[PDB]
From a paper:
Cas12g is an endonuclease belonging to the type V RNA-guided CRISPR–Cas family. Cas12g adopts a bilobed architecture encompassing recognition (REC) and nuclease (NUC) lobes.
We observed a single Cas12g in the asymmetric unit of the crystal structure. In the apo-Cas12g structure, two zinc finger motifs are located at the Helical 1 subdomain II, namely, the HCCC-type zinc finger (His248-Cys252-Cys323-Cys330) and the CCHC-type zinc finger (Cys228-Cys240-His335-Cys339). Fortunately, the structure of apo-Cas12g determined in this study provides an intact view of the Helical 1 subdomain II, which consists of helices α9–α17. In the inactive state of apo-Cas12g, the lid motif is positioned above the catalytic active site, obstructing the catalytic core region and preventing substrate binding and cleavage. In apo-Cas12g, the lid motif interacts with the Helical 1 subdomain II and Helical 2 domains and is held in place above the active site through hydrogen bonding between residues R661-R224, E666-R226 and K672-V632.
Numbering used by the authors: 10 to 544, 622 to 708, 744 to 760
Amino acid sequence: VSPRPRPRYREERTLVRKLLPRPGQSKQEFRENVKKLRKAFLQFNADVSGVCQWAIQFRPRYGKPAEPTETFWKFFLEPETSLPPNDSRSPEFRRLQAFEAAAGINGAAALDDPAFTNELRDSILAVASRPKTKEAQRLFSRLKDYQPAHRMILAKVAAEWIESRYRRAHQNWERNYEEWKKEKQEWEQNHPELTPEIREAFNQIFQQLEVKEKRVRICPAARLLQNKDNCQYAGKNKHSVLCNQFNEFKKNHLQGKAIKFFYKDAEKYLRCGLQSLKPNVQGPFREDWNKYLRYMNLKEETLRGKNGGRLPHCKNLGQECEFNPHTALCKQYQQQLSSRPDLVQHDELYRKWRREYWREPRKPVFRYPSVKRHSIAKIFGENYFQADFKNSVVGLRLDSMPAGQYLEFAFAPWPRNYRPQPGETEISSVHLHFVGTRPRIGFRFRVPHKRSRFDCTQEELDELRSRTFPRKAQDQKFLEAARKRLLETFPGNAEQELRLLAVALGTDSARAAFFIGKTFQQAFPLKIVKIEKLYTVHTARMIRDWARLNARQIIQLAEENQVDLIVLESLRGFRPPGYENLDQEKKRRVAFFAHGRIRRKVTEKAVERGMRVVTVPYLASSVDENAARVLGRVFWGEI
Ligand SMILES: [Zn+2]
Ligand SMILES: [Zn+2]
């Protein structure tokens, strides 16, 4: 039996508490002690980042031959899959030994152990034989004089940082990239009129302009050819300012028949005079008119100027505007097309291609842990801390400070409401980070997942969605493989007994549907607030509170009905450019982020409470809320 990969949903908790002055100690003592914690936090970031800078040079490069360094790369990241299960030592200790050999902190002697394959031994030699940058020599010169336990922690935190951020995202991207290429080739074979020559022509036009966006914010080629003042980008709501203004005038100051016919009578008036109006509206018109000239900032003189008596604005907002001139970008495109009338025909088809197939999905780039976002925490393990939950005091032994000696702090007491009380768990480690200038400590302890009735992991359902079937065009294949995996690993008759909560998120109201097998059993109230309310892409993140709070309601309702499976709805696919006022593409982008966040929190909690999660595609319809029940039938594949 070849050993299995570590879980991604970890069976562990960290409770974070503010570090406080210990009662009877000067603000100055605290400050000097907090200064020592800050220096150790920053040194730990420097050390992990240094290890990452060294390790990341051996990442496999897409579509290239495996380097001889690759086995060491794979092992550093996930040592457990290459070691014997009956190893007397931990994968963490084995990683330490491989790292020391590969970095020349030690020799290959430690690697004579049969725990290590020859492939590993050979890969580690290949790493050690390479010249080291000055930076790596400085890092290894420093780490050589650390205690083994601190080096082990460093290696573990760097390896886990790289594996969990970069490597998962890189593996998701590779499959996304591979399938995008197959979908591109098929779309091009099915639309052969968009030849390479034509694509190139448009590509060069959009480079010459300076359009780096997939989705071009430019009037259609053919609208642009009409040669009128009609852009959909220049105004507010695809009309001039005056057209918007007149609409407020018509709601605020006009009444009865005047709301309809004032525009018409004003143009009749301007061209042919008051006596051209019906006798019975001359009176009201006089008043409506001098009011009109005041609410807009218009003179009757200059209005008589245009086309023999015409108002310089639309009469409705429900019509294409002729007073809304084209943006400078609309006009440059128009200039490019005028010397290329051959391209006009293919404008729309080329923009469809450009939105999907001009740019490959972005290959992830390695990111270092951020000090300001406290991406990582300094680890104090077995003989480097003490905790007294009676007097809420903690001792933290810095790296070179002797055994039994601690810097001592109080901390915000463990809440009584917080379910694992210190006495019903064991603290394996304390984790130090800073939020701004303020020190925080995390008490780390193990909580096993409740066992699911499904003999399948959430990690398998995620791999189906992210690797096996990554494209939107593969949604149907994703849902079919997920349903099949879930039905085949449910112990009984899934179609009669599988307990499922469906919750419809987004522009489908706050309703949930409980199913037993394929049978809709009960609809349940669910009090969610929408993304419209509660109002460095931001830092006023009240999404996090929105996500945690709304996640908790979904989980309570699921647990209350001994649910096996939570089915979520993803957010509506992205509309085509134009009829997207800048503001509403920001608000659709906040929705997507916030909803991503609710799904992740519900998933993490669900796996802890012995459940599984599946996110179905946005309910595509072609006036009451049946939506959660429809979502469940979509899962079962009746719709
Ligand atoms: Zn335009
Ligand atoms: Zn208009």
